[PDB]
Design an enzyme around this catalytic site. Structure first.
Site, mmCIF file in Angstrom:
data_model
loop_
_atom_site.group_PDB
_atom_site.id
_atom_site.type_symbol
_atom_site.label_atom_id
_atom_site.label_comp_id
_atom_site.label_asym_id
_atom_site.label_seq_id
_atom_site.Cartn_x
_atom_site.Cartn_y
_atom_site.Cartn_z
ATOM 1 N N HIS B 29 0.976 -1.148 -0.199
ATOM 2 C CA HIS B 29 0.194 0.456 -0.070
ATOM 3 C C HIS B 29 0.748 1.307 0.109
ATOM 4 O O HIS B 29 0.432 2.090 0.146
ATOM 5 C CB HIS B 29 -1.244 -0.024 1.522
ATOM 6 C CG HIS B 29 -0.394 0.773 2.687
ATOM 7 N ND1 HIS B 29 -0.109 -0.686 3.655
ATOM 8 C CD2 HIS B 29 -0.012 1.183 3.084
ATOM 9 C CE1 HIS B 29 0.223 0.121 4.599
ATOM 10 N NE2 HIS B 29 0.139 1.024 4.711
ATOM 11 N N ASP B 53 -0.515 -7.999 1.405
ATOM 12 C CA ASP B 53 0.880 -6.190 1.379
ATOM 13 C C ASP B 53 1.729 -6.103 1.522
ATOM 14 O O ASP B 53 2.075 -4.906 1.943
ATOM 15 C CB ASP B 53 -0.660 -5.574 2.378
ATOM 16 C CG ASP B 53 -0.278 -3.790 2.323
ATOM 17 O OD1 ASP B 53 -0.022 -3.410 1.577
ATOM 18 O OD2 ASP B 53 -0.991 -3.013 3.627
ATOM 19 N N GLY B 109 3.721 7.213 9.374
ATOM 20 C CA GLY B 109 4.945 7.164 8.345
ATOM 21 C C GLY B 109 6.081 5.791 8.515
ATOM 22 O O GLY B 109 7.249 5.642 8.234
ATOM 23 N N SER B 111 4.697 2.581 8.639
ATOM 24 C CA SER B 111 4.312 1.083 8.033
ATOM 25 C C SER B 111 5.662 0.542 7.135
ATOM 26 O O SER B 111 6.570 1.191 6.851
ATOM 27 C CB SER B 111 3.707 0.999 6.705
ATOM 28 O OG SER B 111 2.116 1.558 7.530
#
Ligand code: BNH
Ligand code: ZN
Ligand code: ZN
Lengths: 16, 151, 22, 181
Positions: B29, B53, B109, B111
């Site tokens: 993502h 993901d 910020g 991930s």
């Protein structure tokens, strides 16, 4: 676009 | 010094990537199928897993790999893009609860960052924060096993 | 015999850090 | 915070030999664990509560080189397989564990922390076995509980076919005993 590395994190906190 | 976590950025946003087993992993993502920058030019993803993901390119320069967890501990620790460590209690395969909820801003910020166990070994990759009205009380994560499997 | 000599160190007190751009 | 560690070589082969003979080391010290060597072998020494402890099977009764010349051991216990010198100025000490945890983490000379499950006062098993060669050089290294407190000092490995699956260690209790001995 391209993913660029803008920084790094050293988990041990190594200064060296 | 070499880093295990790379602070990366794309035109839209910035996030993190974590090197595990020689692969620099991050969230689809954030990167999508985007390629990663290098001194020799764009290097493509080795793995792309939209479902999980999960995307991964071969580890960049100035990096070092993180070891997967093998102690099964549920006392996790999330590392943010500001190098902040956040204690997290593992609730399930891909879920964990902050021991002290923080504003979503604090976990923003991050991930792609790592979910570490007491030995500093990789338990999972931070997927997304689960927040109630702007305060993150939990996190969603991709277990290292998924990475181990995908590769 | 000769003395035991410190030839290195292992540091546990280090916390995660953003490697400085130098 | 999780247990993380890093290593730094502060001295080479020839500087080490001179220092061993000279007994005077002017280098600055930092850290909880010191990478140590004699003319015959290299291992580890852990600073716990102000004392730099190591394995007697590595140090013998030797003095430790310091900026003021050789320093005689404070404690020697062939039976406990322990020797201790005053911690070098600049080092940081670990404190003994006080939580009775059975999930320990062995810190190796390469600064890797590996999980071991306690199976007795002096033994634990690696949750993930490693080659014996990977554990060589780590005698005297610390076994930490989840909180980063010293539970014991690595002493010997239980291996077969060259693969270690368990480790024998010196529990901190033997340290306190040795001090009063
Ligand atoms: C108690 C029970 C578990 C019995 O087991 C053993 O005795 N196991 C031995 C054992 O652990 N012995 C102890 C000593 C006896 C008294 C208890 C030992 O040598 N411990 C070592 C660590 C070894 C097991 C991995 C420790 O003293 C140490 O690190 N010594 C320094 C050293 O090995 N230096 C080498 C050197 O300086 O050359 C070195 C350094 C780095 C890389 C390779 C070689 C093993 C030695 C290696 C081969 C397999 C057997
Ligand atoms: Zn673990
Ligand atoms: Zn403890």
């Amino acid at each position: 676009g391209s993913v660029v590395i803008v920084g790094r994190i050293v988990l041990s906190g190594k200064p060296a | 010094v070499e880093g295990e976590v790379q602070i990366v950025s794309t035109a839209t946003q910035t996030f993190l990537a974590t090197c595990i087993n020689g692969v620099c992993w991050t969230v689809y993502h954030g990167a999508g199928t985007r390629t990663i920058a290098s001194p020799k030019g764009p290097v493509i993803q080795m793995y792309t897993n939209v479902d999980q993901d999960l995307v991964g390119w071969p580890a960049p320069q100035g990096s070092r790999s993180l070891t997967p967890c093998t102690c099964g501990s549920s006392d996790l620790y999330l590392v943010t893009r500001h190098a902040d460590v956040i204690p997290v209690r593992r609730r399930g395969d891909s879920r964990g609860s902050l021991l002290s909820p923080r504003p979503i801003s604090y976990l923003k910020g991050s991930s792609g960052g790592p979910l570490l166990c007491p030995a500093g070994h990789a338990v999972g990759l931070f997927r997304a924060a689960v927040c109630t009205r702007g305060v993150a009380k939990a996190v969603d994560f991709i277990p290292v096993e998924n990475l181990e499997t995908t590769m």
